[PDB]
Design a protein around this ligand. Structure first.
Ligand SMILES: O=C(O)c1ccc(Nc2c(-c3ccccc3O)nc3cnccn23)cc1C(=O)O
Length: 438
């Protein structure tokens, strides 16, 4: 495979389903590089746990935690890290109300080079235990020789785009990492970066972030095919924001419109949304506590019952993970028979205006509340016109893309309900014998 797309290890599935999966201990192993320092971008951290995931010989190397916590949450994180003198912290500014620093990324500086890891897991035990999570591993980027002047840039512009993402923080600890990235050769990168940063973007900047960034890349680097209107859009996520009183407000007017873009020329496109039902969660490896990581509140849900007619169950027989609840987020464009895909995106961004952006100011300004980061796989970046879908995720013409859940997605049954995390479920017990009482 050229894609370097991995799932995290799941405790409790047969070895066959973990063969090519990665635990965080695998990612940080000396086999991947001799660690000099690291930056851990994330939402939630268990610092004691995190340090134990580094190899013993690397546990005193400098670590930067990039987070968005404020006030007492910020104080708690500093208290977690204070026992570790090698750990520094960077508070990402969140100057727009109700924003989150969701981005999950590792910058790993080695003696041998630099690696970038963009993934979907929080840095806590439960996120790497029994969940379906996604990982993209960059190649080992070599250092550019002192005195040599070359861009180190890839055909996908990844090096400049990653620096641009980091520059948006306006943070001194991250300017240090920008300077590290400048000194390395990222030309082998074959994915496109898709980030969200908080702000209000107009004019040139409109295309830099969020769903307008995705749209711009699909216009510039994908081709429209005949019968493109029959190629569905699939979105798959672990949390749902307030989308409005009907699908015209945002979901099918600007979000779907960006997602269905192909090529440079000017909808009945089917939209499948994958989100765990109550039954998915109940029968999961974790049981109802998996629902603590599927934050969809009843206050949000009751305002948009129309949305749930788009919901499809989580099913992942292809990767042995139907009972490993998803915290990965993915978006993709399959063919009408789901045998090919026009592109695939793995990201931290959930189905929310905060993550993807919402147009303001009579369509002239894209407002984003949160930090998000993902990578986009485009056939053109691999010399292909489409990706064939890999039949079994861990099975074995390595130019087939490993989609980690089953296609076609299966619609909710009439008795199914979306997982809503702050109401009780006391009618049937979970895999550990318990009910759910918030
Ligand atoms: O991706 C995801 O599914 C995800 C979703 C939400 C999230 N944070 C969060 C929480 C929250 C509070 C306490 C325990 C868990 C929680 O989720 N409450 C809110 C309210 N509004 C915005 C964000 N909120 C973080 C992530 C993530 O994993 O980064």
């Amino acid at each position: 495979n050229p894609f370097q797309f991995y799932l995290t290890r799941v405790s409790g599935v047969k070895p066959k389903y973990n063969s090519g999966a990665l635990h965080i201990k695998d990612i940080l192993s000396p086999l991947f590089g001799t660690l000099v320092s690291s930056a851990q971008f994330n939402y939630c951290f268990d610092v004691d746990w995190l340090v134990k995931q580094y190899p013993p010989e690397f546990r005193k190397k400098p670590i930067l935690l990039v987070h968005g916590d404020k006030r007492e949450a910020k104080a708690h994180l500093h208290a977690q890290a204070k026992p570790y003198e090698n750990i520094s912290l960077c508070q990402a500014k969140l100057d727009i109300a109700f924003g989150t620093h969701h981005t999950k990324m590792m910058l790993l500086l080695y003696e041998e080079g630099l690696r970038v890891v963009i993934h979907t897991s929080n840095l806590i035990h439960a996120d790497w235990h029994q969940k379906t999570q996604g990982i993209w591993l960059s190649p080992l980027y070599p250092r550019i020789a002192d005195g040599t002047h070359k861009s180190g840039e890839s055909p996908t512009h990844f090096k400049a785009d990653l620096i641009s993402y980091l520059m948006a923080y306006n943070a001194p600890s991250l300017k240090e990492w920008i300077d590290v990235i400048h000194k390395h050769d990222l030309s082998e990168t074959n994915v496109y970066l898709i980030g969200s940063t908080p702000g209000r973007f107009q004019g040139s900047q409109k295309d830099n972030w969020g769903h307008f960034r995705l749209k711009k890349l699909l216009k510039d680097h994908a081709s429209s095919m005949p019968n493109a209107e029959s190629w569905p859009v699939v979105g798959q996520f672990s949390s749902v924001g307030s989308l409005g009183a009907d699908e015209s407000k945002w979901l099918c007017s600007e979000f779907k419109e960006s997602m269905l873009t192909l090529g440079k020329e000017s909808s009945s496109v089917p939209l499948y949304l994958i989100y765990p039902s109550v039954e998915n969660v109940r029968t999961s490896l974790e049981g109802y506590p998996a629902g603590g990581s599927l934050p969809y509140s009843i206050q949000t849900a009751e305002k948009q019952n129309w949305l749930h007619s788009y919901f499809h169950k989580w099913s992942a027989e292809t990767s042995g993970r139907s009972n490993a609840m998803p915290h990965i987020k993915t978006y993709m464009r399959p063919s009408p028979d789901f045998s090919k895909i026009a592109w695939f995106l793995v990201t931290s961004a959930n189905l929310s205006k905060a993550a993807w952006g919402a147009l303001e100011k009579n369509g002239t300004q894209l407002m984003i509340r949160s930090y998000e980061l993902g990578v986009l796989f485009l056939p053109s970046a691999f010399g292909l016109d489409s990706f064939k879908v890999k039949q079994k995720f861990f099975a074995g013409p390595m130019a087939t893309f490993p989609v980690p859940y089953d296609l076609p997605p299966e619609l909710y049954g009439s008795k199914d309900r979306p997982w809503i995390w702050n109401i009780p479920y006391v009618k049937a017990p979970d895999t550990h014998g318990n009910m759910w009482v918030p």
